Design a protein around this ligand. Structure first.
Ligand SMILES: *[C@@H]1O[C@H](CO)[C@@H](O[C@@H]2O[C@H](CO)[C@@H](O[C@@H]3O[C@H](CO[C@H]4O[C@H](CO[C@H]5O[C@H](CO)[C@@H](O)[C@H](O)[C@@H]5O[C@H]5O[C@H](CO)[C@@H](O)[C@H](O)[C@@H]5O)[C@@H](O)[C@H](O[C@H]5O[C@H](CO)[C@@H](O)[C@H](O)[C@@H]5O[C@H]5O[C@H](CO)[C@@H](O)[C@H](O)[C@@H]5O)[C@@H]4O)[C@@H](O)[C@H](O[C@H]4O[C@H](CO)[C@@H](O)[C@H](O)[C@@H]4O[C@H]4O[C@H](CO)[C@@H](O)[C@H](O)[C@@H]4O[C@H]4O[C@H](CO)[C@@H](O)[C@H](O)[C@@H]4O)[C@@H]3O)[C@H](O)[C@H]2NC(C)=O)[C@H](O)[C@H]1NC(C)=O
Ligand SMILES: *[C@@H]1O[C@H](CO)[C@@H](O[C@@H]2O[C@H](CO)[C@@H](O[C@@H]3O[C@H](CO[C@H]4O[C@H](CO[C@H]5O[C@H](CO)[C@@H](O)[C@H](O)[C@@H]5O[C@H]5O[C@H](CO)[C@@H](O)[C@H](O)[C@@H]5O)[C@@H](O)[C@H](O[C@H]5O[C@H](CO)[C@@H](O)[C@H](O)[C@@H]5O)[C@@H]4O)[C@@H](O)[C@H](O[C@H]4O[C@H](CO)[C@@H](O)[C@H](O)[C@@H]4O[C@H]4O[C@H](CO)[C@@H](O)[C@H](O)[C@@H]4O)[C@@H]3O)[C@H](O)[C@H]2NC(C)=O)[C@H](O)[C@H]1NC(C)=O
Ligand SMILES: *[C@@H]1O[C@H](CO)[C@@H](O[C@@H]2O[C@H](CO)[C@@H](O[C@@H]3O[C@H](CO[C@H]4O[C@H](CO)[C@@H](O)[C@H](O[C@H]5O[C@H](CO)[C@@H](O)[C@H](O)[C@@H]5O)[C@@H]4O)[C@@H](O)[C@H](O[C@H]4O[C@H](CO)[C@@H](O)[C@H](O)[C@@H]4O)[C@@H]3O)[C@H](O)[C@H]2NC(C)=O)[C@H](O)[C@H]1NC(C)=O
Ligand SMILES: *[C@@H]1O[C@H](CO)[C@@H](O[C@@H]2O[C@H](CO)[C@@H](O[C@@H]3O[C@H](CO[C@H]4O[C@H](CO)[C@@H](O)[C@H](O)[C@@H]4O)[C@@H](O)[C@H](O[C@H]4O[C@H](CO)[C@@H](O)[C@H](O)[C@@H]4O)[C@@H]3O)[C@H](O)[C@H]2NC(C)=O)[C@H](O)[C@H]1NC(C)=O
Ligand SMILES: *[C@@H]1O[C@H](CO)[C@@H](O[C@@H]2O[C@H](CO)[C@@H](O)[C@H](O)[C@H]2NC(C)=O)[C@H](O)[C@H]1NC(C)=O
Ligand SMILES: *[C@@H]1O[C@H](CO)[C@@H](O[C@@H]2O[C@H](CO)[C@@H](O)[C@H](O)[C@H]2NC(C)=O)[C@H](O)[C@H]1NC(C)=O
Ligand SMILES: *[C@@H]1O[C@H](CO)[C@@H](O)[C@H](O)[C@H]1NC(C)=O
Ligand SMILES: *[C@@H]1O[C@H](CO)[C@@H](O)[C@H](O)[C@H]1NC(C)=O
Ligand SMILES: *[C@@H]1O[C@H](CO)[C@@H](O)[C@H](O)[C@H]1NC(C)=O
Lengths: 446, 446
């Protein structure tokens, strides 16, 4: 809703003030959701291509991250049968599908050559865990606080690297490798594995050099905790245990604690690697209810992470399929619907491409939000969020961007999906525009 | 889970550093949940008393806040029929039940004489709203951005004060009065009413002096937003509109944004007035899964709010009844179970009573959390949370508490519910103790 009233906001953007390097937005096809995106029954191949294109085409959804589950379940793992001991031999199996995640990754890469693939294990194979199963939590055999018949840490590291090798041989580079999912949480009934930061360091001291020996440019994550506070606690313990230099990227989920402050690592970026409305019905609205599933709220959640926790990437849970509101694109039979959450993603990532750097942006009005990003080639994005219920006349002072010639204005609200509204020449360093209520307006400077 | 390892933590507590004044913990019986706690069949009257005592007895749950819905629905409102215009006559009705909330409040007061009652409207009567119904959001007629036939603001203020008068005539003092619930959110199907901060100020400028004339010590809240960020935006706008001194307490819910920083108001306390696991099954465990419903997680959520957003009070959603995990005590027939979330509440509020002041407390270990509270009468509570998975030997240095002579130690973990562990004489200003893994240990100084 909105009403007639106009106020003003002053914004200053300063390319001399520089923060994090951005990675992008993304989603997962884990647990067979990639097969709902690529079913070859119901959704036609034309429509499966279109759905993936909507997500990963720079000009539409703008996404760049595909997060794949290194599976550990019957029929989803590269190690369906384990050797008796870590001496092996190991019989690795690749079916060219990987629960259709290979299809998802290959197709996303077709539409986005800058794809950032995150291979993330939810559990080790059960044979290398205290509980003897990929379900029900438990620990990698060989970290402190375990008493298994053998130390399986090297074997688990080698297994993760082999998964990466399968994708490399198909011509797909992995960008990030993770060995846990939500290690602070035991869901019991599906792939899971628990850890504190001391036990995590006990594994990372083996994983990290093993990875760099095979793939010197492959980054290692830690540790996909359920929330920001749980991640900070694991990060503290990893560093306390001596493992500061055994991971490269802090990864965390937004389910069980959300941050308003940075993470407790120096010199490492962070990615929010999973979040969704896990309980509500399928939803597409931008700003009708004010509920957390809506697109405008996701624009605001992302602004908070990028400006207050210096976050470099942001992932929905699933890309496309069933699962009610857990996807960005809902698929039923040969039909699909796009949630306006994707246009919140696009408002950031259609314009701030991988390698862009967040730069200084301030607003004189608390709920007229602004951030700004400078691409490697010097183009600049300024996504402004008018979270108020009436229009704001904004004035944007540009510092450090004198080499800019043109400005294009894009709008997302209840009747606009990143719509091009205006294009003008830049004849000074000041932008003036009226931002509609409850909207994201992106100023694209070239 | 835990393992064998011991590390140490240094803690410093300083009564010379002083923060917020505490109000307490509590819950609601709105929407008929008080009638599930006091039912006409099933739970016996003796068990109804016992459930209320478990919540509000200082020695058990330690809660002090009862949050009541000033109802607006057929059968639950003090204004069953509206006059045609704000001139009235208003035919107010008091049935002495208030959807059993009177019984909840009167029984809670019997177990806690310091009960802090928060009377909170979810919506104005439909006749005073733009939408003509208590459901489906909409605005108080007469705030900016409305074009109703009449300005109903004074009438709504008088109606809220009359509700308070009915309670005060029955011998129950109301401590806080709120005119909206989640004004950033429209659930459509139940009592709701929307507002931005400008519109809220337009009503608060009438409600506030109306309230203080009738009840000079009755505090006014604003505005029970669905999350911390939504509350900050409304508070910004109320103050931008000129309304800084038309409310007394900032109220907010933890559903759609959680804080790690203070709220944007000077000289006013804040209360987190509603949160719960809205979707999961009924749950009582302390630390088995690591899921957000668990008692240990709630202890940590409260620590975060009290130490990082200076929060003075904390409410579950419902007190007791059905509704899966939305209650602190589940009732089925003549049986009940208590969630260990209640022992997280007690770890703070059994010992930090109304009027206590949060004092300085630091820990040398990130996930050994500490806070500290000084009661008006000089006793001090120090709730330490060992969020690690092994025991910590803590050393607590006490500054500014020379005149305390005794310490009692209370423990909550998977096998203890605020159990008295030890009582010792206080020699010197140094406490030493081993805090078990995944536990809240309270040091009670007298
Ligand atoms: C400051 O401040 C603070 C805070 O506030 C404080 O403190 C506090 O105080 C309060 C007041 O006083 C209190 O309360 C109270 O209480 C009571 C009871 O008591 C009892 O109990 C308790 C508890 O117990 C439990 O716990 C424990 C621990 O753990 C254990 O051990 C036990 O066994 C138990 O257990 C159980 O339970 C639990 C839960 O609870 C569980 O968990 C478990 O498991 C189990 O089950 C206790 O504590 C006590 O004891 C104590 O004390 C005694 C004396 O009495 C002694 O002898 C002992 O020894 C002890 O002490 C020790 O310890 C402790 C701990 O425990 C420590 O702390 C110390 O220090 C020492 O060391 C007992 O046993 C009650 O009764 C009360 O009530 C009342 O009041 C109310 C209000 O307030 C009301 O409502 C009610 O109703 C009543 O009323 C009545 O009374 C009054 C007076 O009293 C009046 O006024 C009225 O009117 C009425 O009257 C009527 O009635 C009567 C009778 O009663 C008659 O007589 C007449 O005539 C008429 O008819 C109260 O509530 C609390 O407790 C406290 N806290 C703490 C923590 O401590 C302080 O004090 C201050 N200070 C200053 C200086 O000021
Ligand atoms: C600095 O970095 C910047 C960031 O990267 C960079 O900007 C971006 O550059 C890239 C690379 O060039 C651009 O991406 C290309 O886009 C081509 C299509 O371009 C045309 O369509 C665009 C989108 O059009 C929609 O949106 C507009 C804005 O709302 C509307 O006006 C349109 O009507 C249209 O709307 C429809 O779709 C919307 C969703 O998209 C929807 O909301 C709406 O409702 C409606 O449905 C237009 O922006 C663009 O228009 C501009 O350019 C034309 C000139 O062509 C002008 O006439 C226009 O007036 C306007 O100025 C175009 O119309 C793609 O074809 C291209 O694909 C190729 O490349 C990718 C990989 O990048 C491959 O995967 C793909 O297969 C293609 O490969 C083929 O070609 C390449 C060479 O092109 C070759 O190498 C390869 O081997 C193969 O042969 C690519 O995706 C991106 O659009 C730019 N973004 C922005 C925001 O501008 C910037 O240029 C850099 N600057 C410098 C100096 O380096
Ligand atoms: C400290 O504080 C804690 C927290 O309050 C107290 O611990 C809790 O106590 C309550 C009761 O006071 C417990 O609830 C009861 O649990 C028992 C045990 O159930 C378990 O074991 C059974 C085998 O003996 C098993 O059958 C159960 O499994 C069934 O039920 C679960 C429910 O989740 C379901 O998921 C399964 O699929 C099964 O269907 C379970 O594993 C249980 O038997 C009790 O049932 C009785 O009462 C209920 C009414 O509540 C009634 O409906 C039943 O028919 C039956 O009459 C009841 O559920 C609770 O589990 C405890 N929680 C924890 C974390 O321990 C603790 O007691 C306090 N300490 C002290 C000293 O007081
Ligand atoms: C900008 O981006 C937004 C967000 O992606 C787009 O808006 C969404 O568009 C989709 C379709 O692409 C909409 O989904 C469709 O909504 C229709 C309306 O549903 C309402 O009204 C009917 C009428 O009775 C009710 O039955 C229903 O419950 C709703 O109240 C539906 O009719 C559509 O149903 C279709 O699919 C189902 C599949 O089971 C079939 O049963 C039907 O027969 C039919 O084939 C569908 O659900 C969605 O509502 C839009 N959301 C919003 C917030 O607008 C914009 O289109 C896009 N802009 C542009 C220009 O493209
Ligand atoms: C999420 O978005 C959906 C649409 O994708 C909204 O669906 C509406 O549902 C109500 C019934 O609950 C219908 O009367 C409307 O016609 C639906 N709208 C449309 C456009 O189809 C749903 O309300 C949204 N939920 C939230 C919480 O915002
Ligand atoms: C919340 O607490 C309940 C107990 O109140 C836990 O219940 C267990 O549920 C599983 C199935 O999900 C049963 O097999 C167990 O027997 C139950 N335990 C008991 C003691 O009844 C439940 O697991 C907890 N949920 C979370 C997420 O922690
Ligand atoms: C997935 O890709 C493989 C080869 O990469 C192909 O054989 C198979 O048909 C694809 N599956 C779907 C459902 O598109
Ligand atoms: C570990 O397990 C083996 C085999 O059960 C047992 O012999 C050994 O004592 C255990 N180690 C410890 C330290 O308990
Ligand atoms: C509510 O309180 C009155 C007076 O104490 C009592 O008579 C009535 O039975 C109570 N109602 C219920 C449902 O317990």
């Amino acid at each position: 809703w909105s009403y007639s009233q106009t106020l003003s906001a002053n914004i200053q953007v300063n390319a001399l003030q520089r923060y994090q390097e951005m990675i992008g937005g993304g989603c997962s096809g884990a647990f067979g959701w990639a097969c709902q995106q690529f079913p070859t029954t119901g959704l036609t191949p034309e429509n499966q291509e279109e759905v993936t294109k909507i997500l990963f085409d720079e000009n539409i959804g703008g996404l760049s991250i595909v997060r794949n589950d290194i599976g550990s379940s019957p029929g989803s793992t590269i190690l369906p049968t384990c050797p008796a001991t870590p001496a092996g031999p190991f019989n690795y199996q690749w079916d060219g599908s990987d629960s259709c995640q290979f299809n998802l990754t290959k197709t996303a890469l077709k539409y986005n050559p800058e794809l950032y693939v995150y291979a993330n294990a939810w559990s080790a194979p059960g044979c290398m865990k205290t509980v003897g199963t990929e379900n029900d939590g438990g620990q990698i055999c060989g970290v402190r606080g375990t008493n298994c018949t053998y130390d399986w840490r090297q074997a688990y590291a080698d297994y993760l690297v082999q998964y990466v090798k399968f994708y490399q041989a198909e011509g797909i580079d992995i960008s990030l490798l993770g060995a846990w999912n939500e290690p602070d949480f035991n869901p019991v009934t599906y792939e899971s594995m628990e850890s504190d930061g001391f036990q995590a360091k006990d594994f990372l001291e083996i994983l990290y050099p093993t990875v760099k020996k095979a793939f010197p440019n492959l980054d290692v994550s830690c540790c996909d905790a359920t929330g920001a506070r749980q991640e900070r606690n694991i990060l503290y313990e990893v560093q306390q245990a001596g493992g500061e230099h055994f991971f490269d990227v802090a990864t965390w989920h937004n389910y069980q604690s959300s941050p308003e402050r940075p993470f407790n690592v120096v010199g490492k970026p962070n990615i929010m690697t999973e979040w969704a409305d896990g309980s509500g019905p399928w939803n597409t609205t931008w700003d009708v209810s004010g509920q957390l599933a809506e697109g405008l709220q996701w624009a605001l959640y992302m602004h908070n992470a990028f400006t207050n926790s210096d976050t470099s990437g942001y992932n929905h849970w699933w890309c496309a399929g069933g699962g009610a509101d857990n996807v960005l694109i809902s698929i039923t039979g040969n039909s699909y619907e796009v949630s306006s959450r994707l246009w919140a993603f696009a408002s950031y990532f259609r314009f701030a491409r991988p390698g862009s750097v967040r730069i200084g942006a301030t607003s004189s009005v608390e709920n007229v939000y602004v951030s700004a990003y400078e691409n490697k080639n010097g183009t600049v994005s300024i996504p402004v969020i008018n979270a108020a219920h009436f229009p704001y006349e904004v004035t944007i002072d540009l510092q450090g961007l004198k080499a800019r010639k043109r400005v294009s204005t894009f709008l997302t609200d209840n009747s606009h999906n990143v719509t091009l509204m205006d294009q003008s020449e830049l004849h000074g360093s000041v932008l003036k525009a009226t931002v509609p209520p409850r909207a994201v307006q992106v100023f694209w400077l070239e």
